[PDB]
Amino acid sequence: DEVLLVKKLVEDAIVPTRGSKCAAGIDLYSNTNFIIQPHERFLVSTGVSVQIPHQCYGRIAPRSSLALKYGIDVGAGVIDEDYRGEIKVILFNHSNEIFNGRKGDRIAQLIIERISYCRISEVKELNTT
Amino acid sequence: DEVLLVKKLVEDAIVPTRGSKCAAGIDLYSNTNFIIQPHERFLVSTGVSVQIPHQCYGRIAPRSSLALKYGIDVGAGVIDEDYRGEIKVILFNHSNEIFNGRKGDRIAQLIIERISYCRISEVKELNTT
Amino acid sequence: DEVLLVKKLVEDAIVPTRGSKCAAGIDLYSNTNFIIQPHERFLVSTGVSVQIPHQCYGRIAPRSSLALKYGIDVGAGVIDEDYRGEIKVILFNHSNEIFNGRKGDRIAQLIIERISYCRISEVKELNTT
């Protein structure tokens, strides 16, 4: 059993949703209206915090439609399993047009990626490949 | 046993290839010639669809050489295990020069990432870290 | 047991570090001072090579603070388990300001992602979803 726990930080926050049965990504919603000028960026608040399942992290990924239509990209950051702050998404507007975001819009996806917490060891030489 | 199934949507599509024994990424090939103006973007067609193995997704990743030499980046999107459409890659040209892409060029990589389909649960408080 | 092995390629390289107990990412440090002009990019040397654990790869991810404050993004490239070259990070400066990087600065994160080395098979049709 694995569960992503979600806390609403404000009453009208939208709990992230999985869009299809085997959607890799969980949709993240903006809690505010916002404007991104051409070739600038904006830090978008989702209104939620999360507790990621053990030995995973949450990767922020772009929505394809916003990339295609509007030139929006998202930093591929990292929501750690121990992070308890609000999820906030940095959107880069790589177009020549102002981007208008609305409260309640889907603006990114969170993917629950399996990772290794391997220890790190310094050595004088690596093996050959 | 895990297998990535690939359907050619056009007869001259190139089946994606794994480049070295433990290459994380599978090379994606353009099915068309294309031009990307400076500081603009272009949606590149690969000519294939795929069926990703269970409990994985396909992440689109940039080729390092195109980033280094030409300032190309790729959105880090998400090919879901249930997606049966053509794989199309959004390339951002963050340089001051026109980028000329050719049919048959390697233009991105697909990485088959392990993920969790955890359910999502709203709670009033998360644990402390 | 999984271990990330790290070789210093120069004596003053900094071994990458995991920042919190369940930090997804391992901090990568610059081995040089560098300057990135507005809306340009720079390939930053870390001074280390690595041996990633089996059935994983190292994904280069952006540091959130540099994205927020300075408009820095990183290509989400791929350090293969068989790669024995120096880790070098492509930083894109999507702001209007010069970015000044210093030797010893944390400039990206490496995430040890679990992946599939599935074989690739061409077929005439995929299943329906």
Side-chain angles (χ1 to χ4, degrees), chain A residues 1-10 12-20 22-101 103-123 125-129, chain B residues 1-10 12-20 22-101 103-123 125-129, chain C residues 1-10 12-20 22-101 103-123 125-129:
Chain A
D1 194 41
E2 290 177 316
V3 188
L4 175 71
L5 303 178
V6 178
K7 177 187 178 179
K8 295 185 184 170
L9 302 178
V10 288
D12 59 8
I14 301 170
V15 177
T17 54
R18 214 182 274 284
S20 65
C22 311
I26 302 168
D27 293 315
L28 296 172
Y29 298 84
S30 182
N31 191 58
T32 75
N33 299 322
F34 62 93
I35 299 171
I36 321 183
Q37 301 293 322
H39 300 290
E40 295 192 3
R41 69 194 185 281
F42 189 87
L43 184 67
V44 187
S45 293
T46 66
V48 307
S49 60
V50 305
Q51 182 172 324
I52 304 293
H54 192 46
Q55 294 168 339
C56 298
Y57 83 104
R59 187 178 70 88
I60 304 305
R63 296 188 62 220
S64 304
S65 62
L66 300 181
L68 173 56
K69 291 178 57 165
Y70 307 112
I72 302 296
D73 195 19
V74 178
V78 166
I79 304 302
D80 304 306
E81 165 193 346
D82 52 10
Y83 182 66
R84 298 289 175 272
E86 185 171 4
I87 309 306
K88 302 189 185 174
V89 179
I90 192 77
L91 297 183
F92 293 95
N93 178 2
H94 294 311
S95 88
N96 294 319
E97 289 68 60
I98 295 164
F99 180 76
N100 295 119
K103 187 175 185 166
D105 280 357
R106 289 173 260 256
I107 50 68
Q109 298 170 244
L110 187 71
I111 298 164
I112 309 304
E113 307 269 350
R114 301 203 182 284
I115 55 163
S116 174
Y117 292 128
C118 53
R119 61 194 195 277
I120 304 162
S121 179
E122 183 196 346
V123 295
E125 292 296 343
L126 305 179
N127 83 359
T128 74
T129 65
Chain B
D1 194 41
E2 290 177 316
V3 188
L4 175 71
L5 303 178
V6 178
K7 177 187 178 179
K8 295 185 184 170
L9 302 178
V10 288
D12 59 8
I14 301 170
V15 177
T17 54
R18 214 182 274 284
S20 65
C22 311
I26 302 168
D27 293 315
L28 296 172
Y29 298 84
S30 182
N31 191 58
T32 75
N33 299 322
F34 62 93
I35 299 171
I36 321 183
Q37 301 293 322
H39 300 290
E40 295 192 3
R41 69 194 185 281
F42 189 87
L43 184 67
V44 187
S45 293
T46 66
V48 307
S49 60
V50 305
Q51 182 172 324
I52 304 293
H54 192 46
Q55 294 168 339
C56 298
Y57 83 104
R59 187 178 70 88
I60 304 305
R63 296 188 62 220
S64 304
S65 62
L66 300 181
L68 173 56
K69 291 177 57 165
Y70 307 112
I72 302 296
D73 195 19
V74 178
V78 166
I79 304 302
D80 304 306
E81 165 193 346
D82 52 10
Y83 182 66
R84 298 289 175 272
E86 185 171 4
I87 309 306
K88 302 189 185 174
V89 179
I90 192 77
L91 297 183
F92 293 95
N93 178 2
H94 294 311
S95 88
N96 294 319
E97 289 68 60
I98 295 164
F99 180 76
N100 295 119
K103 187 175 185 166
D105 280 357
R106 289 173 260 256
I107 50 68
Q109 298 170 244
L110 187 71
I111 298 164
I112 309 304
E113 307 269 350
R114 301 203 182 284
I115 55 163
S116 174
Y117 292 128
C118 53
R119 61 194 195 277
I120 304 162
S121 179
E122 183 196 346
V123 295
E125 292 296 343
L126 305 179
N127 83 359
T128 74
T129 65
Chain C
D1 194 41
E2 290 177 316
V3 188
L4 175 71
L5 303 178
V6 178
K7 177 187 178 179
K8 295 185 184 170
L9 302 178
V10 288
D12 59 8
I14 301 170
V15 177
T17 54
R18 214 182 274 284
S20 65
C22 311
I26 302 168
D27 293 315
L28 296 172
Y29 298 84
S30 182
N31 191 58
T32 75
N33 299 322
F34 62 93
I35 299 171
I36 321 183
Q37 301 293 322
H39 300 290
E40 295 192 3
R41 69 194 185 281
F42 189 87
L43 184 67
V44 187
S45 293
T46 66
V48 307
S49 60
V50 305
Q51 182 172 324
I52 304 293
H54 192 46
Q55 294 168 339
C56 298
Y57 83 104
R59 187 178 70 88
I60 304 305
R63 296 188 62 220
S64 304
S65 62
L66 300 181
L68 173 56
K69 291 177 57 165
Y70 307 112
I72 302 296
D73 195 19
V74 178
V78 166
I79 304 302
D80 304 306
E81 165 193 346
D82 52 10
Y83 182 66
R84 298 289 175 272
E86 185 171 4
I87 309 306
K88 302 189 185 174
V89 179
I90 192 77
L91 297 183
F92 293 95
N93 178 2
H94 294 311
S95 88
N96 294 319
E97 289 68 60
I98 295 164
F99 180 76
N100 295 119
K103 187 175 185 166
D105 280 357
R106 289 173 260 256
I107 50 68
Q109 298 170 244
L110 187 71
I111 298 164
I112 309 304
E113 307 269 350
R114 301 203 182 284
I115 55 163
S116 174
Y117 292 128
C118 53
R119 61 194 195 277
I120 304 162
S121 179
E122 183 196 346
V123 295
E125 292 296 343
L126 305 179
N127 83 359
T128 74
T129 65

